Enzyme design. Structure first.
Site, mmCIF file in Angstrom:
data_model
loop_
_atom_site.group_PDB
_atom_site.id
_atom_site.type_symbol
_atom_site.label_atom_id
_atom_site.label_comp_id
_atom_site.label_asym_id
_atom_site.label_seq_id
_atom_site.Cartn_x
_atom_site.Cartn_y
_atom_site.Cartn_z
ATOM 1 N N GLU A 1 34.296 30.387 37.892
ATOM 2 C CA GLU A 1 33.046 29.707 37.619
ATOM 3 C C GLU A 1 31.914 30.434 38.324
ATOM 4 O O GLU A 1 32.064 30.877 39.467
ATOM 5 C CB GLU A 1 33.079 28.251 38.090
ATOM 6 C CG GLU A 1 34.178 27.431 37.483
ATOM 7 C CD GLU A 1 34.021 25.958 37.799
ATOM 8 O OE1 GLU A 1 32.915 25.565 38.236
ATOM 9 O OE2 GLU A 1 34.995 25.196 37.609
ATOM 10 N N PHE B 1 26.299 31.218 35.704
ATOM 11 C CA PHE B 1 26.111 31.269 34.257
ATOM 12 C C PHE B 1 26.918 30.220 33.520
ATOM 13 O O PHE B 1 26.640 29.957 32.345
ATOM 14 C CB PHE B 1 26.538 32.630 33.715
ATOM 15 C CG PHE B 1 27.956 33.018 34.070
ATOM 16 C CD1 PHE B 1 29.050 32.466 33.396
ATOM 17 C CD2 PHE B 1 28.191 33.976 35.051
ATOM 18 C CE1 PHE B 1 30.365 32.846 33.717
ATOM 19 C CE2 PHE B 1 29.485 34.365 35.374
ATOM 20 C CZ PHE B 1 30.581 33.795 34.708
ATOM 21 N N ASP C 1 23.478 43.816 39.957
ATOM 22 C CA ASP C 1 24.179 42.684 40.535
ATOM 23 C C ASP C 1 25.590 43.093 40.941
ATOM 24 O O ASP C 1 26.553 42.353 40.756
ATOM 25 C CB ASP C 1 24.176 41.510 39.547
ATOM 26 C CG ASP C 1 24.611 40.175 40.184
ATOM 27 O OD1 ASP C 1 24.545 40.030 41.417
ATOM 28 O OD2 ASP C 1 25.054 39.273 39.428
HETATM 29 C C1 LIG Z 1 31.822 34.247 39.074
HETATM 30 C C2 LIG Z 1 32.965 33.920 38.084
HETATM 31 O O1 LIG Z 1 33.117 35.039 37.228
HETATM 32 C C3 LIG Z 1 34.442 35.230 36.818
HETATM 33 O O2 LIG Z 1 35.249 34.434 37.176
HETATM 34 C C4 LIG Z 1 34.748 36.314 35.779
HETATM 35 C C5 LIG Z 1 33.795 37.170 35.178
HETATM 36 C C6 LIG Z 1 32.293 37.426 35.458
HETATM 37 C C7 LIG Z 1 31.264 37.480 34.348
HETATM 38 N N1 LIG Z 1 30.507 37.645 33.533
HETATM 39 C C8 LIG Z 1 31.800 37.788 36.665
HETATM 40 N N2 LIG Z 1 32.758 37.814 37.762
HETATM 41 C C9 LIG Z 1 34.519 37.920 34.214
HETATM 42 C C10 LIG Z 1 34.123 38.936 33.318
HETATM 43 C C11 LIG Z 1 35.035 39.514 32.455
HETATM 44 C C12 LIG Z 1 36.343 39.070 32.506
HETATM 45 CL CL1 LIG Z 1 37.545 39.806 31.442
HETATM 46 C C13 LIG Z 1 36.754 38.094 33.368
HETATM 47 CL CL2 LIG Z 1 38.474 37.659 33.297
HETATM 48 C C14 LIG Z 1 35.827 37.484 34.242
HETATM 49 N N3 LIG Z 1 35.943 36.523 35.185
HETATM 50 C C15 LIG Z 1 37.193 35.808 35.504
#
Ligand SMILES: CCOC(=O)c1c(/C(C#N)=C\N)c2ccc(Cl)c(Cl)c2n1C
Length: 334
Positions: free
Chosen positions: A23, A26, A142
């Site tokens: 989470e 966004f 970021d």
């Molecule tokens: C801050 C929470 O964001 C995430 O948990 C996240 C995020 C993000 C976003 N946008 C940032 N950490 C992910 C982006 C691509 C993929 Cl494939 C996955 Cl699995 C993502 N995850 C699990």
């Protein structure tokens, strides 16, 4: 948000939610079975139905469409978007499934740092990936451990305390909702960031060097298990910078319009206030954070110090960082 992201939910008549992966500000990322792609598991980013987040999601889709066309083999390790859609008015972005963020891994490992040989590999991939963005007139803005994800985060455990060690530390860079093109409007006001490059704080203008600053900060958090800038106040952040890196360059103090941080030629900082006493305790010159005097630790900290150069023009570029001696151990066997 809460109403549309429960396991068993079906999105776009296609994606069956099996798990929540994380989470963020966004919204949320869930893991889904893609029933129209043979049951392949995908990650789906479910974005808040809120103007600023929708706008960022549309921007991220355009960036990702550009990056994935430019690098169709994923050679440069940016997350691969598969498609996007709308679900109850929410923007949903489908990604190849990735593993745990590097932040989450450190957290679940009791804030233990990564081993130096894994830091070297991860740093090299991060530099190569973000250098690819810089080669295509983009700035990420970021970069932080939460936005660096392991491709697969399987680990083993052993006594040293008890430590988890990655079996494979390959990573990808994610979250392009803030990435900005050179010819695009660059916010002179920048929202909350885990790391704040000094030209951002001082509103001197920013571009690709502010990514290099963030990467230097990432590397010292991988090495220590914690950030050396534990703050979200910008003046405290500048105070921490001075303790770790030395005084801000006078030429940057002269040029900035952020006079609220300053009094005469120097930072207007009360070292004996609550924040002041904390900064004095929590921060110290960069190289005192070294855990060993061995040469590969010196090599790492030399790179970090070049990435944390105050002046963004003088600051090392990623193309230069990839040639740094810290990475020689990854070079071709003789
Ligand atoms: C801050 C929470 O964001 C995430 O948990 C996240 C995020 C993000 C976003 N946008 C940032 N950490 C992910 C982006 C691509 C993929 Cl494939 C996955 Cl699995 C993502 N995850 C699990």
């Amino acid at each position: 948000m809460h109403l549309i992201c429960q396991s068993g939910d079906v999105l776009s008549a296609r994606y069956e939610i099996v798990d929540t992966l994380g989470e963020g500000a966004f919204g949320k990322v869930v893991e889904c079975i893609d029933h129209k792609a043979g049951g392949r598991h995908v990650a789906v980013k479910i974005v808040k139905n809120v103007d600023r987040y929708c706008e960022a999601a549309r921007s991220e889709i355009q960036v990702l469409e550009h990056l994935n066309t430019t690098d169709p083999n994923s050679t440069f390790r940016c997350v691969q978007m598969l498609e996007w859609f709308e679900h109850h008015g929410h923007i949903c972005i489908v990604f190849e499934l990735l593993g745990l963020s590097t932040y989450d891994f450190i957290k679940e490992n009791g804030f233990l740092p990564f081993r130096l040989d894994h830091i070297r590999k991860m740093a090299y991939q991060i530099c190569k990936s973000v250098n690819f963005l810089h080669s295509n007139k983009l700035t990420h803005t970021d970069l932080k451990p939460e936005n660096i994800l392991f491709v697969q985060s399987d680990y083993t455990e052993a006594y040293n305390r008890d430590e988890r060690t990655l079996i494979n530390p390959d990573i990808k860079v994610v979250d392009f909702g803030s990435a900005t093109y050179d010819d695009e409007h660059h916010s002179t006001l920048v929202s909350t960031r885990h790391y704040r490059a000094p030209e951002v704080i001082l509103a001197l203008g920013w571009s690709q060097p502010c990514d290099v600053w963030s990467i230097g900060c990432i590397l010292i958090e991988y090495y220590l298990g914690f950030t050396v800038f534990p703050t979200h106040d910008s003046k405290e952040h500048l105070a921490m910078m001075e303790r770790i890196l030395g005084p801000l360059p006078k030429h940057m103090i002269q040029k900035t319009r952020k006079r609220k941080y300053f009094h005469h030629d120097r930072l207007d900082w009360d070292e004996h206030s609550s924040a002041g006493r904390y900064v004095s305790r929590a921060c110290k010159p960069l190289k005192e954070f070294m855990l060993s005097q061995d040469v590969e630790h010196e090599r790492l900290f030399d790179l970090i110090q070049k990435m944390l150069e105050y002046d963004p023009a003088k600051r090392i570029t990623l193309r230069e960082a990839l040639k740094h001696p810290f990475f020689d151990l990854l070079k071709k066997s003789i």
